[PDB]
């Protein structure tokens, strides 16, 4: 998702093309018009490069990190992946 | 920063013509002769069904006349 949304005003807008992706973007996911059956999903690899206008409660606001794991961690990936 | 963007222009094809003024002006010409034809035939069909409908009195009043005679002649003789 880094790949589209990224902070309004700081790149050279992509020709005034990613700002008004962004702002549809923006729009669509909270607006006038209520929707309450819809659920997004988002996966980057660069989290400091996404608008902070869309990382706020009422919008995708659930925040997880996956790292390394640990001993036990490796212990059940090698049990799932030798079965 | 060589992003560029395009709009667009339409063009209508020509509607569906250019074939219909020659063949057409000849069909219709032909369609009127048909029409004065069957008027014509129209009206030389009804004058032979008002003919054939006068030969039937005739025909009818000729076979009558030869009937009684007949029976006249007969009844005469015996």
């Given at each position: 998702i880094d790949a589209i949304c990224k902070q309004r005003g700081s790149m050279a807008g992509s020709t005034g093309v990613h700002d008004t992706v962004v702002n549809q973007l923006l729009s669509k996911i909270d607006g006038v018009e209520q929707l309450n059956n819809i659920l997004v999903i988002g996966m980057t690899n660069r989290?400091?490069?996404?608008?902070?206008?869309?990382?706020?409660?009422?919008?995708?606001?659930?925040?997880?990190?996956?790292?390394?794991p640990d001993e036990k961690g490796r212990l059940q990936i090698l049990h799932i992946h030798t079965a | 920063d060589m992003r560029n963007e395009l709009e667009e222009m339409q063009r209508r094809a020509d509607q569906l013509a250019d074939?219909?003024?020659?063949?057409?002006?000849?069909?219709?010409?032909?369609?009127?002769?048909?029409?004065?034809?069957?008027?014509?035939?129209?009206?030389?069909?009804?004058?032979?069904?008002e003919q054939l409908e006068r030969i039937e009195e005739g025909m009818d009043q000729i076979n009558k006349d030869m009937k009684e005679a007949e029976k006249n002649l007969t009844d005469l003789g015996k």
């Open positions: 989290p400091d490069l996404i608008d902070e206008a869309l990382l706020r409660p009422g919008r995708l606001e659930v925040k997880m990190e996956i790292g390394l | 074939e219909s003024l020659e063949s057409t002006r000849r069909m219709l010409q032909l369609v009127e002769e048909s029409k004065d034809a069957g008027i014509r035939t129209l009206v030389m069909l009804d004058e032979q069904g």
